[PDB]
Enzyme design. Structure first.
Site: not given
Ligand code: GTP
Ligand code: MG
Ligand code: GTP
Ligand code: GDP
Ligand code: MG
Lengths: 51, 51, 427, 426, 46, 427
Positions: C61, C135, C196, C244
């Site tokens: 995206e 993704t 998280n 290591e």
């Molecule tokens: N630690 C942390 N986790 C995040 C953050 N943003 C999203 N996530 C985690 O990402 C997970 C979902 O995947 P996303 O990164 O939101 O989206 P994606 O992995 O690219 O998958 P798509 O939505 O299909 O594109 C959620 O469970 C969130 O916990 C962030 O800013 N910090």
């Molecule tokens: Mg995503």
């Protein structure tokens, strides 16, 4: 001389506590006075109403 | 919708307790006075030189 | 000694986007990209006085990617290095691994190739992704597979973000997690879990920030990554490189899952009061009140622990504290490893980010351990996977994309084999 | 932190609460517009117990007004401090029960209670940790007693571990408004004894007596009576809202006063109360307040406590006082009049101090006595109930609505054995 | 300063691993070596 | 040599509010936390120019705690050290021992653990509580129990506040007293009774303050505590540590309940007029008109006595005075010991507090004895516990919290057994 300096400190802190207590009790009496005069105004306005 | 009114709303509701205890990003501040040097020039904690 | 860092998914590129702010601050690089040897493991000097990072943000995206392309670091990242697709995998492992990966992974890898050819003494790779998404899970696994067939011998540090037990933001993340692990087993050499909720409880308790957004989380995760690579970036009294962890933390070719921890996560006012020394931060790095994974190590036994020390630390008292830890009986080691530790000391103290909530402390500790509580976590994800799969819920999206039931059953028994391996090893 | 939800039923309940929120708002220094303008910073610390933050310094009370006739709502919005309530808390019917307990418990309740329960449930989970609920109502009217009574039953059923206060007025034959007073009071009491945690018995006859003798008022309108009851309710919860040298919240007052789970009908008094003429001719000492506390012409029930014994008693003091004088005054009053107190409990007096006096006084006091003189008032009512039920007067307006005869027999038995057990412990 | 011009530091005037603008225009290699200035590109890098 | 002090309940932390005011004025520390090695037993020196006490205030209601957080000593106390629950125990032992203790005691103990690990030469603990209330009695006993499990061998000085016979403020304090003792027997090593009525009498007679509040009471209680730790803090001619009361004053493992007293309690105008020497204060510390517990030791026979001396005192005349006491016949000792004293001399005189009613005195005495009058006090309370339990009064509150009648019966007989022990040893 250290003894002398210590009791000087004691007298200083005594005066400070006295000043604080005085200002506090004054504020309290002032609050009381304002509540009393409010009561008096409420007392007078009802007499005006009856007249 | 204006910077001014938007800022005046927060200036008004800064008196709230939750407004001071939940600053979205900041965290609770406690309003403690620091000795003017521990924030920027000196780092916190005990210091014994290694280098 | 050079290492490149790739970011897959929406979570990964937000994390590393906090990381690179931390790196430019640690090496004195203003975001326009010029300085006003230690940097050379991340930033490669090129163009005109420009230190352009060895990194590629790649995602499907374009919303968050072009958000970066217009943000404050417009001039930092090489424009070609930010790969952006046209449409999302949308939390669908099959869509990210078979439909869209097939067009994106070749461009990603043959960028990676010319980055590695600009590189000279490549140490390894380190990836950033959350396995719950689509993704970061799907084409991430596809990317690691083709990287392993490309190099194989080079160590790959995987900093993944697993879904928390109770706090969760998706519905099919059990499916995504299971399918992601099935490749994370036999491709990643060293994989670090960070959920998280654990960071949520840390930000609530120690940092006393009560409405934490994602940046506060990403900020202190960047502090952890910077802390375990500061040995490569800066000379220490006792330095350890990225090879290591490959040797000293992975006792078996399939047991590579590492809990992280950091200390002291302390605000400004809590710093002016606590006395920061070495013995108590070594203690602080061991209770579950300061771990980056919501798990109970008291139910588990440690396999091997590693301790990174940054700042003003002498080897005397770290040896003393580690002695105290090994003589305590609240925590216990396995019967295999009497030398269950690996210490490391570096000179440069952790830096502060303006706007961040961490105060400038003389020292810090980053613990990276190996236990059996991770075996408890995988069974926890396995149960909630089996419940949804018993009714064949959500399966039709994967089947409609092109996958089938075979790999669902075999990934299920693969996690069951991993469980039996952890129960066999713990004894 | 510790939270108190307010619930007002009936016309009496509404106007009592109107004066109550006036007095509390004046204590916390918040203007009738709804913004803070006070002086001391002690006031800001404990206003979450009674208010919520809305927008730009707007503290709305945590109250629920409830009745069945619009006139009371109009009288609420007419006076000052009427623009500060949230209009969504004006949960409010349209037909009107009108001195019919059956109407207030079966006919109109069956459709008003679901909405009042929704608003009180939303106002309950809106905060973090409840201390309890606080209901001001009557026992003579219909929409107050009956509706409030079922609400008490619903609340105790949903939230059993939370405290519960009921400021309830009782009918007296000397000042008797309506005719079905015992028919409503008896049934409401029968439900209170099994539902409410404790009740603070009030009555208008004793209040008129107070304003005649001590206050020397000429025209005691309902404003001053509601003003006195409001001062009582502010005094009982002062311990939460302000720091003290000895704190005593609602629950510890309950555990100090209630020896047996059915003995929770207290009589209340207030000190100091003096006329405007003799107001400055007096001193302000702990003995001066104590002689006005333990005076029998200062109780707020039509039950002379010197006609029986006390079981327990409490006194909440406000003002910069010397705790030694407090304890020795309580010990003197206990050692002198030893017959008025029960023998098998030593030191029947609980005390507490808070450093913030009410606005206008230097040192005030609130007395809460759990005596056995209450069985006099309950017999005073039950004997009127048996007089009417002997020949079924007024019975059909209840009978033709769903209520049956065994309900009246049960209320008789519950009233009768309650006053029997009060007599037993006497 | 602007992006369209190079951001080079005044010490790393002309080097191999770094350059996008001409260090010096119209200076012959043989000219410079006869003047005995060391060849800028030959300077080493870490 | 370090000792840490924990404060439990409403009365506990108000006593602390006076104790730490006294300590800071003793060691010259302003309330902001910095001086403008004797302090090392109470304040640990963090970083640069900052000392933070070795204490934990704890309570269940936040009213008095955040009064401290907003008082004058905001900077002195560590923000984390103050511990506050969400709702009070409300004069209810069962509630404060089984319902809310189960939430608060873990956080308290896991805090004192890291305070002890900060410490190096821990002498012991000293606890401050009143048993009449609910918070002090209930989780006070719970906290003491788990402390005895965690450390055990370390001494625990308990300065409890028992209810007076006739002057009293609560109703269920007999239930709470009895239930608190039942565990105070086998948990505390050295327990000191402090009653409010005797302190009211002292302030009325000696200090001639006809209207005393709780501030004055806590002021001279702090004087007593400071007087019996002054040996640890400063060097004297003949010093005595915290382990000596353990030996020199407890003849039997379950007889440890010490009367305390203090002299000279003298106002500002009675000092500049009385001629003070060691003989008269050694006398005045033995009259019942100057004890801290309303009981008549004329009825009892002493078991042991400890005499702390502060200021200008030489060992000669204190020896002559204790000889006069031993040879007087208006008081009698037990035959179970011919040697009934333990002196102790420290050089530094007792400091004066601003606004305090005491004067700058050259020398002072703190007597801590052990007799059989305490055995009389327990029977006096036992009587009025039987009176209320015979009618099953107030029992439904405790049973509702989850307890039964078994612990009432066994606590009752435990006090009867203890009564047997005093009348037996007194023989
Ligand atoms: N630690 C942390 N986790 C995040 C953050 N943003 C999203 N996530 C985690 O990402 C997970 C979902 O995947 P996303 O990164 O939101 O989206 P994606 O992995 O690219 O998958 P798509 O939505 O299909 O594109 C959620 O469970 C969130 O916990 C962030 O800013 N910090
Ligand atoms: Mg995503
Ligand atoms: N000597 C002395 N005693 C106090 C003081 N404050 C309270 N007390 C005693 O404390 C006893 C009641 O317990 P509190 O300390 O008030 O409250 P608590 O112990 O925390 O128990 P809860 O009220 O249930 O929380 C009373 O008998 C008082 O005598 C004080 O400042 N000095
Ligand atoms: N103190 C006081 N008592 C009131 C007030 N209004 C009504 N009452 C008492 O309440 C009783 C009637 O209750 P009512 O208002 O009819 O209750 P409702 O019909 O259920 O709303 C009478 O005995 C009055 O003495 C008031 O403003 N103040
Ligand atoms: Mg208390």
């Amino acid at each position: 001389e250290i003894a002398d300096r210590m009791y000087e400190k004691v007298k200083r802190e005594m005066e400070a506590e006295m000043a604080r207590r005085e200002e506090e009790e004054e504020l309290i009496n002032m609050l009381r006075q304002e509540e009393l005069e409010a009561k008096r105004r409420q007392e007078d306005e009802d007499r005006k109403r009856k007249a | 919708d204006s910077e001014l009114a938007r800022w005046k709303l927060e200036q008004a509701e800064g008196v709230y307790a939750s407004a001071q205890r939940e600053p979205l990003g900041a965290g609770y501040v406690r309003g403690h006075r620091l000795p003017e040097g521990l924030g920027s020039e000196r780092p916190f904690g005990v210091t014994y030189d290694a280098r | 000694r050079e290492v490149i860092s790739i970011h897959i998914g929406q979570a990964g590129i937000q994390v590393g986007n906090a990381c690179w702010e931390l790196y430019c601050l640690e090496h004195g690089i203003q975001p326009d990209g010029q300085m006003p040897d230690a940097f050379n493991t991340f930033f490669s000097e090129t163009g005109a006085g420009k230190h352009v990072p060895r990194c590629i943000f790649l995602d499907l995206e374009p919303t968050v990617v072009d958000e970066v392309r217009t943000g404050t670091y417009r001039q930092l990242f090489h424009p070609e290095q930010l790969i952006s697709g046209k449409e999302d995998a949308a939390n669908n492992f099959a869509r990210g691994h078979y439909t869209i990966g097939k067009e994106i992974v070749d461009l990603a890898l043959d960028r990676i190739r010319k980055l590695a050819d600009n590189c000279t003494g490549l140490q390894g790779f380190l990836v950033f992704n959350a396995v719950g998404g689509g993704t970061g899970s799907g084409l991430g696994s596809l990317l690691l597979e083709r990287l392993s067939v490309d190099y194989g011998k080079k160590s790959k540090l995987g900093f993944t973000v697993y879904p928390s037990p109770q706090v969760s933001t998706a519905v099919v993340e059990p499916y995504n997690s299971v399918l992601s692990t099935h490749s994370l087993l036999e491709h990643t050499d060293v994989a670090v879990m960070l959920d998280n909720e654990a960071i949520y409880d840390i930000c609530r308790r120690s940092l006393d920030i009560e409405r934490p957004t994602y940046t506060n989380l990403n900020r202190l995760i960047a502090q952890v990554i910077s802390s375990l690579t500061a040995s490569l970036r800066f000379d220490g009294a006792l330095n350890v490189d990225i090879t290591e962890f490959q040797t000293n933390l992975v006792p078996y070719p399939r047991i590579h899952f590492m809990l992280s921890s950091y200390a002291p996560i302390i605000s400004a006012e809590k710093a002016y009061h606590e006395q920061l020394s070495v013995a108590e931060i070594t203690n602080a790095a061991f209770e579950p009140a300061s771990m980056m994974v919501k798990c109970d190590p008291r139910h588990g036994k440690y396999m091997a622990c590693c301790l990174m020390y940054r700042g003003d630390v002498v080897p005397k008292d770290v040896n003393a504290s580690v002695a105290t830890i090994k003589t305590k009986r609240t925590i216990q080691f396995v019967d295999w490893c009497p030398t269950g530790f690996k210490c490391g000391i570096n000179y440069q103290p952790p830096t502060v980010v303006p706007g961040g909530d961490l105060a400038k402390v003389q020292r810090a500790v980053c613990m990276i351990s190996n236990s059996t509580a991770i075996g408890e976590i995988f069974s926890r994800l396995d149960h909630k996977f089996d419940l949804m799969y018993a009714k064949r819920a959500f399966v039709h999206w994967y089947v409609g994309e092109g996958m089938e039931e075979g790999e669902f059953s075999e990934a299920r028994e693969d996690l069951a084999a991993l469980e039996k391996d952890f129960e066999e090893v713990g004894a | 932190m510790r939270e108190i939800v307010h619930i007002q039923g009936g016309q009496c309940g509404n106007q009592i609460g109107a004066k109550f929120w006036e007095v509390v708002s004046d204590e916390h220094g918040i203007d009738p517009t709804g913004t803070y303008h006070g002086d001391s910073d002690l006031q800001l610390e404990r206003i979450n117990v009674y208010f919520n933050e809305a927008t730009g310094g707007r503290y709305v009370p945590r109250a629920i007004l409830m009745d069945l006739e619009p006139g009371t709502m109009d009288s609420v919005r007419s006076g000052p401090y009427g623009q500060i309530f949230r209009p969504d808390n004006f949960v409010f019917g349209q037909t009107g029960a009108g001195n019919n307990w059956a109407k207030g418990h079966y006919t109109e309740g069956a459709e008003l209670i679901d909405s009042v329960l929704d608003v009180v449930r939303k106002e309950a989970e809106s905060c973090d940790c409840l201390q309890g609920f606080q209901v001001c109502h009557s026992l003579g009217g219909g929409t107050g007693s009956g509706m409030g009574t079922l609400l008490i039953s619903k609340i105790r059923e949903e939230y059993p571990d939370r405290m519960m206060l009921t400021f309830s007025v009782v009918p007296s034959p000397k000042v008797s408004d309506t005719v079905v007073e015992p028919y409503n009071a008896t049934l409401s009491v029968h439900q209170l004894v099994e539902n409410a945690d404790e009740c603070m018995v009030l009555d208008n006859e004793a209040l008129y007596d107070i304003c005649f003798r001590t206050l020397k008022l000429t025209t005691p309108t309902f404003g001053d009576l509601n003003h006195l009851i409001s001062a009582v309710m502010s005094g009982i919860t002062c311990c939460l809202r302000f720091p003290g040298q000895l704190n005593a919240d609602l629950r510890k007052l309950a555990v100090n006063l209630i020896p047996f789970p059915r003995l929770h009908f207290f009589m209340v008094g207030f000190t100091p109360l003096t006329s405007r003429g003799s107001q400055q001719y007096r001193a302000l000492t702990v003995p001066e307040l104590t002689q006005q506390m333990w005076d029998a012409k200062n109780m707020m029930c039509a039950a002379d406590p010197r006609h029986g014994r006390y079981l327990t008693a409490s006194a909440l003091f406000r003002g910069r006082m010397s705790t030694k004088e407090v304890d020795e005054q309580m010990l003197n009053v206990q050692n002198k009049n030893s017959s008025y107190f029960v023998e098998w409990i030593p030191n029947n007096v609980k005390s507490s101090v808070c450093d913030i006096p009410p606005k206008g006084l230097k040192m005030s006091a609130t007395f809460i006595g759990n005596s056995t003189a209450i069985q006099e008032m309950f017999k005073r009512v039950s004997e009127q109930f048996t007089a009417m039920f002997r020949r079924k007067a007024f019975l059909h307006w209840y009978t033709g609505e769903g209520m049956d005869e065994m309900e009246f027999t049960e209320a008789e038995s519950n009233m009768n054995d309650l006053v029997s057990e009060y007599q037993q412990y006497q | 300063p602007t992006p369209w011009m190079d951001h080079t530091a005044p010490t790393a005037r002309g080097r191999f691993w770094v350059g996008t603008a001409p260090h010096v225009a119209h200076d012959t290699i043989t000219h410079s070596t006869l003047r005995s200035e060391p060849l800028e590109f030959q300077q080493r890098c870490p």
